[PDB]
């Protein structure tokens, strides 16, 4: 079955630098596309960044345009996302995100089940 | 973001629904996906290209959306459905995917509830730590769900509020305090500071000075 | 109630135990079940049967029991297993079937912090409203578990307390905020009032007065 | 699959009256026992009780013990408990809960439904 397993979230202090890795397992991991979705505490859910199937493109929300670095190693069907000149801003929760469709779509079927990054 | 209710409820068996709207950027030319969250845990998906029900979903949900503005709907509300409902699109001009607010759905057991706001100015002990801290309380309000807002003077303040997510009270009413957090000079130097809470669109304000 | 501990918690990857003891009558007799519940929802049977795991469980989930105590181990330590766990028996003095006080797991990602108890006297607004209402905030504590008590003088008030299930903060350190509604007879008449916050066995105490 | 649905939660004043009803699907009904669990605002799991496949013998918690009257209809597949003269430290959330074999092995549980009572 598909599973969806995040690691790296931890405590920095604001600028320091941090890296996610997501592993993923029973499905095609290059054929998809992957995302990342993260959660403030007592906050709705907000979008951080996908890169596609190939990884030949790569969107970024306008609140981390610049800050973070999505990447994707298909041969070891492992999820990457580093995270450069962390703000407080970031404190959350942050989630793997499977996509069935062509990937232009917000449609996810399986998220991970998260780690929890906090900065202060 | 795209505009949905902080709260939206409905007696035991009635048909409510989620509404999500936005911009012509994003919903009217795009679809609408439905992501149904219990607190603490990952999200679900339970509509996608806003009609089509993924397996495993109910024959009660059912999803529509007419330009720039969207819809989920419930039929036979159910314990069970009580989550946090998002909704989501793809924005061209963003270039990204957007997320909405956050729906609080809960399934009405008593009559709704107006909240008891009461605002705490700084005691003594802690000023004679030189640290003051203010707390406003919030209690007896059904449902569940809420919006805070801390204003100096007439002033809103951006920092230092923190808010705890709503608990039930031994009566089956939630309850919630938000504090802010300040030094003993802020508090001296400004006239008044104000606790705003609301709740369904009707809103309580209370204030105090030292 | 079967005594169990009311916060554990362990670092990614490691493995922990949730220890439930209870009386000779209890879990020696018969077998303990073990039930996980994520907050607000409905509880799921995690362990049967001392350490048989229902279907769906995972691997690394194992229960075990010794006498009159039992303890279910969990290894390999995810996100996924943050919850409230309770341990179950049958119990033949009461004829019936004991819980758990409860046991909330969190997966450390920051260092342990202590509560810092600041406590309210009543708003000088609300008594002259005949409402007296004290409020005893709690905040930058980790992980998010407390249990708190309310004393007049020495003599504890057991009812009108209110306690809020402790919320993340924007720094993911916990807080939460115990209330009393007190009458102003009551507030005016007693010589103080004392609210104590209990975290991971470590005990703190605030007192206010009138004057 | 195994469902579970409760429900007659409402809102009632001390003293006053409730009946809970709970339907089941996917599982012979007649064949398990059946139980109340009921867990009041934040607080622990509370134990209610549990009716005999055959509606039989019926146990208690000390708690409520001759004040509330669990039943089932096993033709229609619905547990019934009665709620009668209700205090305030009733108030709570109640599950429905199936057994795999006297023992405290829940294999399914309902939604829940909330009684309040003030
Ligand atoms: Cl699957
Ligand atoms: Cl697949
Ligand atoms: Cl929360
Ligand atoms: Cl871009
Ligand atoms: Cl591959
Ligand atoms: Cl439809
Ligand atoms: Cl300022
Ligand atoms: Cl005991
Ligand atoms: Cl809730
Ligand atoms: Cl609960
Ligand atoms: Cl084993
Ligand atoms: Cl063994
Ligand atoms: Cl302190
Ligand atoms: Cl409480
Ligand atoms: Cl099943």
């Known amino acids: 079955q598909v599973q969806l397993v995040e690691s790296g979230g931890a405590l920095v202090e604001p600028g320091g630098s941090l890296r996610l890795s997501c592993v993923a397992s029973?499905?095609?991991?290059?054929?998809?596309?992957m995302s990342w979705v993260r959660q403030a505490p007592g906050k709705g859910l907000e979008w951080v960044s996908t890169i596609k199937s190939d990884g030949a493109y790569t969107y970024y929300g306008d609140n981390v345009k610049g800050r973070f670095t999505i990447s994707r190693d298909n041969a070891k069907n492992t999820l990457y996302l580093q995270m450069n000149s962390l703000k407080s801003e970031d404190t959350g929760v942050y989630y793997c995100?499977?996509?069935?469709?062509?990937?232009?779509?917000?449609?996810?079927?399986?998220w991970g089940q998260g780690t929890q990054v906090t900065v202060s | 973001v795209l505009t949905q209710p902080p709260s939206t409820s409905g007696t035991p068996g009635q048909r409510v629904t989620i509404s999500c709207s936005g911009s012509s950027s994003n919903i009217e030319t795009n679809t609408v996906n439905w992501y149904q969250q219990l607190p603490g845990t990952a999200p679900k998906l339970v509509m996608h290209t806003n009609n089509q029900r993924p397996s495993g979903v109910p024959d009660r949900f059912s999803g529509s959306r007419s330009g720039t503005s969207a819809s989920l709907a419930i039929g036979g509300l159910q314990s069970e459905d009580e989550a946090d409902y998002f909704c989501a699109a793809w924005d061209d001009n963003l270039n990204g995917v957007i997320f909405g607010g956050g729906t609080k759905l809960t399934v009405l057991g008593q009559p709704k509830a107006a909240p008891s706001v009461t605002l705490f100015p700084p005691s003594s002990e802690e000023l004679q730590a030189n640290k003051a801290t203010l707390v406003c309380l919030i209690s007896d309000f059904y449902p569940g769900a809420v919006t805070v807002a801390w204003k100096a003077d007439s002033s809103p303040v951006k920092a230092g509020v923190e808010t705890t997510t709503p608990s039930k009270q031994s009566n089956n009413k939630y309850a919630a305090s938000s504090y802010l957090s300040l030094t003993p000079e802020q508090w001296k130097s400004h006239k008044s500071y104000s606790c705003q809470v609301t709740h369904e669109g009707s809103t309580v304000e209370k204030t105090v000075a030292p | 109630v079967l005594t169990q501990p009311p916060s554990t918690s362990g670092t990614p990857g490691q493995r922990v135990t949730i220890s439930c003891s209870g009386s000779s009558s209890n879990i020696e007799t018969n077998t303990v079940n073990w039930y996980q519940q994520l907050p607000g929802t409905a509880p799921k049977l995690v362990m049967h049967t001392n350490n048989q795991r229902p279907s769906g469980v995972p691997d690394r989930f194992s229960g075990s029991r010794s006498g009159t105590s039992a303890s279910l181990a969990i290894g390999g330590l995810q996100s996924e297993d943050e919850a409230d766990y309770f341990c179950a028996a049958w119990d033949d003095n009461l004829n019936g079937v004991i819980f758990g006080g409860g046991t909330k797991l969190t997966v450390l990602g920051q260092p342990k912090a202590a509560p810092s108890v600041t406590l309210f006297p009543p708003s000088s607004e609300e008594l002259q409203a005949n409402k007296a209402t004290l409020v005893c905030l709690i905040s930058d504590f980790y992980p998010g578990a407390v249990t708190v008590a309310w004393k007049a003088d020495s003599s504890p008030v057991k009812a009108g307390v209110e306690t809020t299930t402790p919320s993340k903060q924007s720094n993911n350190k916990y807080a939460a905020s115990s209330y009393l509604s007190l009458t102003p007879e009551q507030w005016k008449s007693h010589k103080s009032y004392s609210c104590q916050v209990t975290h991971e066995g470590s005990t703190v105490e605030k007192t206010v007065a009138p004057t | 699959?195994?469902?579970?649905?409760?429900?007659?939660?409402?809102?009632?004043?001390?003293?006053?009256?409730?009946?809970?009803?709970?339907?089941?699907?996917?599982?012979?009904?007649?064949?398990?026992?059946?139980?109340?669990?009921?867990?009041?605002?934040?607080?622990?799991?509370?134990?209610?009780?549990?009716?005999?496949?055959?509606?039989?013998?019926?146990?208690?918690?000390?708690?409520?013990?001759?004040?509330?009257?669990?039943?089932?209809?096993?033709?229609?597949?619905?547990?019934?408990?009665?709620?009668?003269?209700?205090?305030?430290?009733?108030?709570?959330?109640?599950?429905?809960?199936?057994?795999?074999?006297?023992?405290?092995?829940?294999?399914?549980?309902?939604?829940?439904?909330?009684?309040?009572?003030?």
């Open positions: 029973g499905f095609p991991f290059n054929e998809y596309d």
């Open positions: 995100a499977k996509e069935a469709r062509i990937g232009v779509s917000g449609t996810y079927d399986y």
